[PDB]
């Protein structure tokens, strides 16, 4: 069975450089090429080069000639691929790939699962987690309501309701890159608008790149006005 | 060097129908294309290799052809399984993908609008979420008023993966402003225009109200 | 065209020994240089593409380097079955065209 | 598995037309296409032209356009070199190889046929 397991999502400045593995099992790993593909937010793929594990032997892409750097340890049946001088435009999901025959082919039968790197200024930060308020004066017989999670660095956030118990008609959506350089979703739920003042619903946000674990409990907005 | 041009950008089958997508070379060099498959969050998985030949593990459904610089992928009958992006490859080049998503009748938005939080104006911002729900097509048009004054430029849209359920579609659009210009103004309000809908619908809030 | 210009008509080495093929592209061909190997009757192997990556079954003795227009083969620990022809070839653009060609003789002799 | 195998040696004289077989097997015939190269006496190694194995459409270099023709049989997996009013500089070696892509530059010739000899007899 084979199998290529790669390195943990990476967050680097521009002008830094990143490393990410790939480590094979289940082959010989000296026996086959192993290229690098990439794969930026909401685009294609695009082809790095390859490394023959076996001679050390390399070959990039002219886009990347001088910036990125392939290597291997057989001792640990490991492949890697530098980039350097990174830029915005390097966030990607970074894959190695491994093709289908012996010899040299274009067909890439095996992948590893990806390796997310988020080239970016911004530092490390924990949501700000505010109430969607319902309404039932709002109603499309059902009620909606949500949390905004706001300003956070860098992906991902995962949101659930009522620790799990609430899964029909959640939504959480895709997070949104903002001029600030911070990431910010919303998580939305519909319920029925008759239960708005027996149930509660709690949003459990956990954004682990900062260990933040955040329940905020979301009720209709309370009205004083005359 | 060679480009892949792939068509169409978007396919919107049902299931059981069949899939015909199509990659065109900007020059032909030979057979030597791959197809592949990829689904979110996922690596890519090879389905065809030599234009024609299916890679092991794929099922029969999966075929592909070519005459010269044309390659056509071809599902003969959908599965659930099957909508996901598309891409074709010759040598290090690749095609740009098309995303084969589930049509199915048209599904009207409900629409909700949140206003910002107490909470969230107290650190200097207002957030002002407007939620469309579980419509299809994915195509609809969110406007942002304030006071009747048309906005731009200042939201953004998100949209769901294609519901594994019911094929449908949620979007949020978040018109984001600070907590001055929020308290310059009164009506906000969320104009929402989609193919479900014989008129569009509007839901607004006047701030500090009930 | 591309020309690739192989200075070294004839060389004579020893068992044991090494030696170096030079080959000077007259355009900068990047890394798309390959070498080829040549014996009396057969036709050229590969030996080297990409510059200094080696084909299948090529021994590890026969190292490649170079990249824009100076190229190099290098032979190390040269056998006897080494007695031939050397071509260098630029594939970075077609037409592919080929060095003029470097005899390499072995005085041990009588092999391959 | 790859094998190119080519026709026997020719003994023409010179007017006369000669067609040279390139018999291929071990892979997808029309994932490469096939390279000819002469090798005459004192010229050294020039690519004549190439073909398209999948299509079938061939290109010939620049001094090897008009007496040289380039066909193909995809069902025979085989490639043809003709060349029309042999001339006495035509007495060469003929060769047919495999061109591959490995990125980043164009096709190289890692597989080639053992050769075709053509001598022009007066
Ligand atoms: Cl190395
Ligand atoms: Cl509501
Ligand atoms: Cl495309
Ligand atoms: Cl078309
Ligand atoms: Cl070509
Ligand atoms: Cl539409
Ligand atoms: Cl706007
Ligand atoms: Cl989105
Ligand atoms: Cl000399
Ligand atoms: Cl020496
Ligand atoms: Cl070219
Ligand atoms: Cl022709
Ligand atoms: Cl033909
Ligand atoms: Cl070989
Ligand atoms: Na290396
Ligand atoms: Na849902
Ligand atoms: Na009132
Ligand atoms: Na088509
Ligand atoms: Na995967
Ligand atoms: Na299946
Ligand atoms: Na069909
Ligand atoms: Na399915
Ligand atoms: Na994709
Ligand atoms: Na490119
Ligand atoms: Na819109
Ligand atoms: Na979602
Ligand atoms: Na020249
Ligand atoms: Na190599
Ligand atoms: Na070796
Ligand atoms: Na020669
Ligand atoms: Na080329």
């Known amino acids: 069975q084979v199998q290529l397991v790669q390195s943990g999502a990476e967050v680097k400045k521009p002008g830094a450089s990143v490393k990410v593995s790939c480590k094979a099992s289940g082959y010989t790993f000296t026996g086959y090429y192993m290229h690098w593909v990439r794969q930026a937010p909401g685009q294609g793929l695009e082809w790095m080069g390859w490394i023959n594990p076996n001679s050390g032997g390399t070959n990039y892409a002219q886009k990347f000639q001088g910036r990125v750097t392939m290597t291997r340890d057989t001792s640990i049946s490991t492949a890697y691929m530098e980039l350097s001088r990174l830029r915005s435009d390097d966030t990607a999901v970074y894959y190695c790939a491994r093709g289908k025959n012996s010899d040299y082919n274009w067909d890439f039968q095996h992948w590893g699962q990806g390796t997310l790197v988020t080239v970016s200024s911004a530092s490390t930060k924990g949501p700000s987690v505010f109430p969607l308020a319902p309404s039932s004066k709002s109603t499309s017989g059902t009620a909606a309501l949500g949390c905004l999670v706001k300003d956070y660095f860098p992906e991902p956030v995962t949101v659930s309701w009522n620790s799990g118990a609430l899964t029909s008609g959640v939504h959480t959506f895709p997070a949104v890159l903002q001029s600030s350089g911070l990431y910010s979703l919303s998580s939305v739920v519909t319920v029925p608008s008759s239960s708005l003042g027996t149930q509660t619903y709690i949003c459990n946000v956990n954004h682990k790149p900062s260990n933040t674990k955040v329940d905020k409990r979301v009720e209709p907005k309370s009205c004083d006005k005359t | 060097e060679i480009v892949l041009t792939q068509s169409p950008a978007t396919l919107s089958l049902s299931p059981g129908e069949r899939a015909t997508l199509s990659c065109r070379a900007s020059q032909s060099v030979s057979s030597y294309l791959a197809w592949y498959q990829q689904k979110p969050g996922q690596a890519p998985r090879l389905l065809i290799y030599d234009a024609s030949n299916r890679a092991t593990g794929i099922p029969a459904r999966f075929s592909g052809s070519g005459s010269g610089t044309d390659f056509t992928l071809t599902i003969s009958s959908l599965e659930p399984e099957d909508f996901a992006v598309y891409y074709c490859q010759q040598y290090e080049f690749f095609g740009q993908g098309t995303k084969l998503e589930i049509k199915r009748t048209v599904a009207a938005p409900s629409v909700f609008i949140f206003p910002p939080s107490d909470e969230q104006l107290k650190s200097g911002t207002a957030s002002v979420v407007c939620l469309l729900n579980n419509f299809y097509p994915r195509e609809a048009k969110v406007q942002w008023k304030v006071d009747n004054a048309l906005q731009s430029g200042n939201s953004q849209e998100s949209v769901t993966e294609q519901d594994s359920k019911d094929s449908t579609y949620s979007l949020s659009s978040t018109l984001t402003l600070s907590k001055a210009d929020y308290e310059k103004h009164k009506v906000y309000a969320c104009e929402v225009t989609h193919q479900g809908l014989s008129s569009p619908v509007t839901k607004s809030f006047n701030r500090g109200e009930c | 065209d591309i020309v690739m210009t192989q200075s070294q008509k004839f060389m004579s080495t020893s068992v044991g020994d090494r030696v170096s093929i030079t080959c000077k592209a007259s355009?900068?061909?990047?890394?798309?240089v390959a070498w080829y190997q040549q014996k009396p009757g057969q036709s050229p192997k590969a030996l080297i593409f990409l510059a200094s990556n080696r084909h299948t079954g090529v021994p590890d003795r026969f190292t490649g380097s170079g990249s824009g227009t100076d190229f190099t083969l290098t032979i190390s620990n040269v056998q006897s079955e080494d007695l031939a022809d050397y071509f260098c070839l630029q594939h970075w653009n077609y037409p592919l065209t080929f060095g003029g060609g470097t005899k390499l003789e072995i005085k041990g002799g009588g092999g391959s | 598995q790859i094998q190119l195998v080519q026709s026997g040696p020719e003994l023409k004289k010179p007017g006369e037309t000669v067609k040279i077989s390139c018999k291929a097997s071990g892979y997808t015939f029309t994932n490469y296409e096939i390279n000819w190269v002469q090798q005459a006496p004192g010229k050294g190694l020039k690519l004549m032209g190439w073909?398209?194995?999948?299509?079938?459409?061939?290109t010939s270099a620049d001094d090897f356009k008009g007496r040289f023709a380039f066909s193909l049989e995809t069902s025979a997996s085989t490639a043809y070199l003709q060349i029309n009013n042999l001339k006495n500089e035509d007495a060469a070696t003929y060769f047919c190889?495999?061109?591959?892509?490995?990125?980043?530059?164009?096709?190289?010739?890692?597989?080639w046929g053992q050769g075709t000899l053509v001598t022009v007899s007066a």
């Open positions: 190889a495999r061109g591959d892509y490995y990125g980043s530059s164009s096709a190289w010739l890692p597989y």
């Open positions: 355009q900068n061909v990047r890394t798309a």
């Open positions: 073909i398209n194995t999948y299509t079938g459409e061939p």
